[PDB]
Amino acid sequence: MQGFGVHTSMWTMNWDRPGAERAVAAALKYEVDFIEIPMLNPPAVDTEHTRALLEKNELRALCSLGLPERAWASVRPDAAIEHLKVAIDKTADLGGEALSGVIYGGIGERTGVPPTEAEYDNIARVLSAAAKHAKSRGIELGVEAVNRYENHLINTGWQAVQMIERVGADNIFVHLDTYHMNIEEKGVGNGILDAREHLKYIHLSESDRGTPGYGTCGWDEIFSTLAAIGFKGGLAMESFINMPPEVAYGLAVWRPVAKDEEEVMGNGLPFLRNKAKQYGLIGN
Amino acid sequence: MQGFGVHTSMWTMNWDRPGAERAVAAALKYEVDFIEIPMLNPPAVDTEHTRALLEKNELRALCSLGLPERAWASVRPDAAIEHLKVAIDKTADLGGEALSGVIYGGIGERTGVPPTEAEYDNIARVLSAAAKHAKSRGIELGVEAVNRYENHLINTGWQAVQMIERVGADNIFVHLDTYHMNIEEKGVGNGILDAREHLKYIHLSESDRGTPGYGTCGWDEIFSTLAAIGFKGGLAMESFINMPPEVAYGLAVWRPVAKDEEEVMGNGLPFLRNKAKQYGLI
Amino acid sequence: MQGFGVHTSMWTMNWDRPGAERAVAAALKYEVDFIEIPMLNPPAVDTEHTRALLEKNELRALCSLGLPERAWASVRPDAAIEHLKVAIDKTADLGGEALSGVIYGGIGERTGVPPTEAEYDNIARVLSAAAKHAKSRGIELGVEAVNRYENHLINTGWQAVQMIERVGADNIFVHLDTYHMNIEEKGVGNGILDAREHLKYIHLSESDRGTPGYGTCGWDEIFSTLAAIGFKGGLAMESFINMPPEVAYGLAVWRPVAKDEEEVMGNGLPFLRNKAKQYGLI
Amino acid sequence: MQGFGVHTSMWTMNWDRPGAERAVAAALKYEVDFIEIPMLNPPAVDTEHTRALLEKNELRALCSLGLPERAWASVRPDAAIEHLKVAIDKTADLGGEALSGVIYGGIGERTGVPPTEAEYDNIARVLSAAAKHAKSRGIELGVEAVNRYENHLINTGWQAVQMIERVGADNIFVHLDTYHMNIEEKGVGNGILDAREHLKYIHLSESDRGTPGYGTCGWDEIFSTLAAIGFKGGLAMESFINMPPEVAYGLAVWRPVAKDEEEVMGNGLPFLRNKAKQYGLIGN
Ligand SMILES: [Mg+2]
Ligand SMILES: [Mg+2]
Ligand SMILES: [Mg+2]
Ligand SMILES: [Mg+2]
């Protein structure tokens, strides 16, 4: 992707037909370039209805997910491949251009001990098979590094790149998230530097998942480093005003992240757009 | 507690006799004013050996714990009270001045939904009983706010203050932790601002539990805000370097937090001391 | 002075009748609580017209100036007192509540050596006389610390407080400016900390005099520290956008500080108001 | 230059023979790679004495200056060329590898109005001639952007690059200074970004000229952006513990920048070395 986008938890809990209507209508009011749609219940997504909305309103889209425990790639790789194939097909059917997020495991996945080579070997096989299926449907895959409490396998930019090189495909990119990097990166710019050759998507998410510009993320370091590495991918907001039920346990939003979507979008999006112009990011 | 201290996890998580000696030796090496003693198994602590060590070396101390699952206050308050009474007595008998930490629950609590009045009612009953026991032994209790993933009940300075007000004791204080605040506070200074009437203790920990000064924590805002509220409590350095593996895994340490002790202590403690001097906490 | 205000330089440096109307119109457009009126030529100010504008539009005001070279307090104290008395009377008569700024000297003072006791004695004699005149008219005086290149005498919060103590008046306060503190203070919060007992006014200005929020000022540390000291004075936005060229050149503006008013006010004012809300100054 | 260095105002007020002895001894105690020597009194410099000190102690060096008013390039270009030729020759004779700083004007230079094309024409002619003379002596020239109060002509990384492109000499590099960028750059990383193709030297100088790490400079943004652009030049401290008399009026140090040299070097150098390590700067 390119330009500015929003994860649709800003506006709807589930990507059902009324939720798709609500999210797409809210998106055009902010003049964003794309939306990111959760692919958490693929058989439940009405792809024809979503595609019609996206094309009517000239909105691009990608999808993201976390794997359900029955299909965690680290331990149940055959089930993961089957699940990812379903999710890839539905993403392509609605006009999405990539499937990203925690496509290699669960949001809330934790064995209780550090990750093992056997787990990474399983993940690499899953992603290799999924990337071939994605290629057959004309979409790319994204691997999002998330913090230690949401997954034990891929937490940093450097680990995400290590997995992309372990898999050896040509259609998997790295997806970073400033909320996760705020915990995981030894200096937030290091995550961007480490991922630079594969970085195509970033969640500009505040440290408490609230309003960008009004938490602890080091935004000037983030934007300066994105400009320096020539970042030209998707800049996407992620604030859990609404919480998709299938990932609520893992995402740990126990209290409102902000007053409402009007506060987050009304203050956060102008802040991020202004920072992108300030540091001269490509496309700004 | 006043001045600079260290949480002894970098040398000792099991407070047995050689572990106590090892941690006191480190405290003298780094010229700190106090130590924080983790109590993984309060019944096993030799109170007289530790008391003698502290007095001989002019070191002050407090203790900290998190409740085990069999005694999580929100659901098993009678067992929480029993566990806390033992820890309070051991703390007092070794010469400690407070028991702090996750004394209201455990690492690993998560319901998937917001905390409830029923849960908070049980925590308040536990903390009231524990505060009474602590007062009878002449020590205080600290409530450490921890991030959303560790516990769903007390995550912010403002939530910690709400619980202290709900209990209505006068010997419970707020314990903040810059690693947790880096996630939970809407601007890191707001945790200190919200807790200012009750803040007596802060863990100075980097955002990745590594070396203070070399992460994402907003140290200038932290120290300026501490100075502005006139903070004179404990400045306690905390790093997860060299934690025993089983403890580290329980805290979601899946990879090294830093290179070694010389990196963490040789760079992190001077950074924190220098910042405290810069902003007049000294 | 309380709440949010603007220095009117962005619309009016020459406070004549159309300029006063222009600035008050801008103040209502941006829904501020007060304006700061620069007084380049105090005798030319129509006090009755300005007073009626402020009362009709429910606007509060203060005034500011820097001393011209013919009246630099450090070297020409009697001329400085005559100049300040005229400015104080004009301020009081138009309804302003204080005269602040570089009232102790001028932009462009520099001896090449540290400030001397002789200079500070002259400044103190000037300020003492001016403060008594201000008290007789019911207004206060503000001393604005400015950076080393503008004036060699009062650069930090701690220097400003020392001058307030040297003068010994009770109606002189400290006026800080985030642009100057960005250069002068050893950690920006230290200027607020050092001035805390006397700080009643702060210029919120970006590091390049452009758009607040989009430079190098440490806004989170600034706002957290203001909240922590209980700041209840004036929060006054200052930008050099659209200043008259001759005034701008005297302030070392050699190139545009920002694109236009819409960039500065449309991005910078919401940023500052949002930060004030975030840290509970509101 | 490469590695870590120190401007010798840390240790001596003038580069006389006793001052050279003291500064070189101090530089070895801190194990820095080079020193930066003010070339403010070229006829007074004992070049063989300094050259012998540097070679004996395996220390590299460069020189810096500001032009005296009698030879300000923007208004007296012929005098400026003659002065720079003298300074270039002394720099080369003592073993220095470059002459940097405000080689295009004065520290404290101010007309009262914005810079004009005629002034830039004069600087360009001066630098072109100085660049050829520097080439003949085998050294390079650096152009340091300084803040609006020290010079009205070159204040930003982008302005410095514009001059270097205008002159067209490949032996002139850009020299940035975090103390100056703290005022001049709209986000400090923008100075590094704008200068990335020509940046070979940076003063890591705190916002009040005191101890690095204990002022207002955005060090994490600075180091992350330097790493992102692949900076491989000199990282040099500048703290005016001692003040060269010829530039004191322009540098505006009216009160101690720090307690003493041991405080700045004892706390500031480890901080900067640690940050360079943290962000993986080339050569650290
Ligand atoms: Mg994300
Ligand atoms: Mg802690
Ligand atoms: Mg001002
Ligand atoms: Mg310099």
For chain A, domain boundaries: 1-284
Q: How far is CA A86 from CA A65, A80, A83, A173, in A?
A: 12, 10, 5, 20
Residue B238 annotated among the catalytic residues of the structure: yes
* Short-list D277, D220, D198, D244, CA closest to D68: D244
For chain B, the residues whose C-beta falls within 8 A of a C-beta of chain A are 110, 112-115, 147-150, 152, 155, 181-188, 207-208, 210, 214-218, 249-250, 252-255
Q: Are A189 and B217 in contact (CB under 8 A)?
A: no
Q: What is the least distance, in Å, from the CA of D75 to any CA of chain B?
A: 44
Residues with beta carbon < 5 A to ion ligand 3? C 177, 203
Q: What is the least distance, in Å, from the CA of B223 to any CA of chain D?
A: 12
* Short-list B146, B278, B150, B155, CA closest to B205: B146
Tokens of A189: 């710019």
Helix (H, G, I), strand (E, B) or coil at D197: coil
| Distance separating alpha carbons of residues B264 and D132, to the nearest angstrom | 50
For chain A, the residues whose C-beta falls within 8 A of a C-beta of chain C are 213-214, 267, 270-271, 274-275, 278
Do the chains contact at C193 and B225, CB–CB below 8 Å? no
Look up residue B152 and give its DSSP letter: S
- Residue type at position C157: G
- Backbone breaks in chain C after residues (C–N over 2.5 Å): none
Instruction: Sort out which chain C residues have CB atoms less than 8 A from B196's CB and list them.
Output: 228
Burial class (CB in 10 A: 0-12, 13-18, 19+), C246: exposed
Torsions phi, psi for A79 (to 5 deg) = -65, -35
Nearest ligand (C-alpha, residue B147): 2
* Short-list C202, C87, C77, CA closest to C127: C77
* Tokens 């006791």 found at: C117
Q: Are D266 and D274 in contact (CB under 8 A)?
A: no
Q: Are D216 and D178 in contact (CB under 8 A)?
A: no
Q: What is the least distance, in Å, from the CA of D221 to any CA of chain B?
A: 11
| Distance separating alpha carbons of residues B101 and C231, to the nearest angstrom | 32
Burial class (CB in 10 A: 0-12, 13-18, 19+), B86: middle
Left, alpha or beta for B252 (phi > 0: left; psi -120 to 50: alpha)? Answer: left
Angle formed by the axes of helices D77-93 and D117-136, to 10°? 30
* Range D150-170 burial, b when 16+ CB lie within 10 A, else e: bbbbbbbbbbbbebbeebebe
Left, alpha or beta for B101 (phi > 0: left; psi -120 to 50: alpha)? Answer: left
Q: Are B45 and B17 in contact (CB under 8 A)?
A: no
How far is C-alpha B232 from the geometric centre of its chain's CA atoms? 16
Q: Tell me the sheet residues that pair with D5.
A: D34, D236
| Distance separating alpha carbons of residues A268 and C72, to the nearest angstrom | 46
Q: How many CB atoms lie within 10 A of CB B191?
A: 30
In B165-272, where do the E strands start and end? 172-177, 199-204, 234-237
How far is C-alpha C50 from the geometric centre of its chain's CA atoms? 19
DSSP letters of A171-206?
A: SEEEEEEHHHHHHHSSSHHHHHHHTTTTEEEEEE--
How far is C-alpha B131 from the geometric centre of its chain's CA atoms? 17
Q: Tell how many helices (H) and how many strands (E) occur in chain B.
A: 11, 8
Tokens of B2: 């006043």
End-to-end CA distance of chain A: 14
| Distance separating alpha carbons of residues D27 and D7, to the nearest angstrom | 10
Q: What is the least distance, in Å, from the CA of C274 to any CA of chain A?
A: 8
Can you state the percent helix, strand and coil of chain A, rounding each to 5? Answer: 45, 15, 40
How close is the Cα of B177 to the center of ligand 2, in Å?
Answer: 5
| Distance separating alpha carbons of residues A149 and B85, to the nearest angstrom | 31
Q: How many residues does chain B have?
A: 282
Say which of A36, A109, A119, A144 is annotated catalytic. Answer: A144
How close is the Cα of D48 to the center of ligand 4, in Å?
Answer: 26
* Short-list C218, C223, C214, CA closest to C279: C223
Q: Are B212 and B206 in contact (CB under 8 A)?
A: yes
Do the chains contact at A228 and D223, CB–CB below 8 Å? no
Look up residue B264 and give its DSSP letter: I
Do the chains contact at D270 and B274, CB–CB below 8 Å? no
Q: Are C101 and C84 in contact (CB under 8 A)?
A: no
| Distance separating alpha carbons of residues A6 and A33, to the nearest angstrom | 9
Find which of D274, D275, D279, D281 to mutate to test the B interface (most B CBs within 10 Å of its CB).
D274
Nearest ligand (C-alpha, residue D236): 4
Burial class (CB in 10 A: 0-12, 13-18, 19+), C110: middle
* Tokens 């209980």 found at: C230
Q: What is the least distance, in Å, from the CA of B53 to any CA of chain C?
A: 39
| Resolution of the solved structure (Å) | 1.5
How far is C-alpha C106 from the geometric centre of its chain's CA atoms? 13
Q: Tell me the sheet residues that pair with B3.
A: B234
Q: Which chains contact D through at least 3 pairs of Cβ atoms less than 8 Å apart? A: A, B, C
Choose among A192, A218, A229: nearest Cβ to D220. A218
Do the chains contact at D224 and A223, CB–CB below 8 Å? no
Choose among D210, D249, D255: nearest Cβ to C112. D249
| Distance separating alpha carbons of residues A245 and A253, to the nearest angstrom | 11
Q: Are B74 and B114 in contact (CB under 8 A)?
A: no
Q: How many interchain CB pairs under 8 A, A with B?
A: 81
Instruction: Sort out which chain A residues have CB atoms less than 8 A from D271's CB and list them.
Output: none
How close is the Cα of B6 to the center of ligand 2, in Å?
Answer: 11
* Short-list B236, B228, B173, CA closest to B200: B173
Residue A36 annotated among the catalytic residues of the structure: no
How close is the Cα of A146 to the center of ligand 1, in Å?
Answer: 7
Residues with beta carbon < 5 A to ion ligand 4? D 177, 203, 238
Q: Are A143 and A103 in contact (CB under 8 A)?
A: yes
| Cβ-based neighbours of C60, under 8 Å, separated by 6 or more | C1, C5, C33, C34, C35, C54, C97
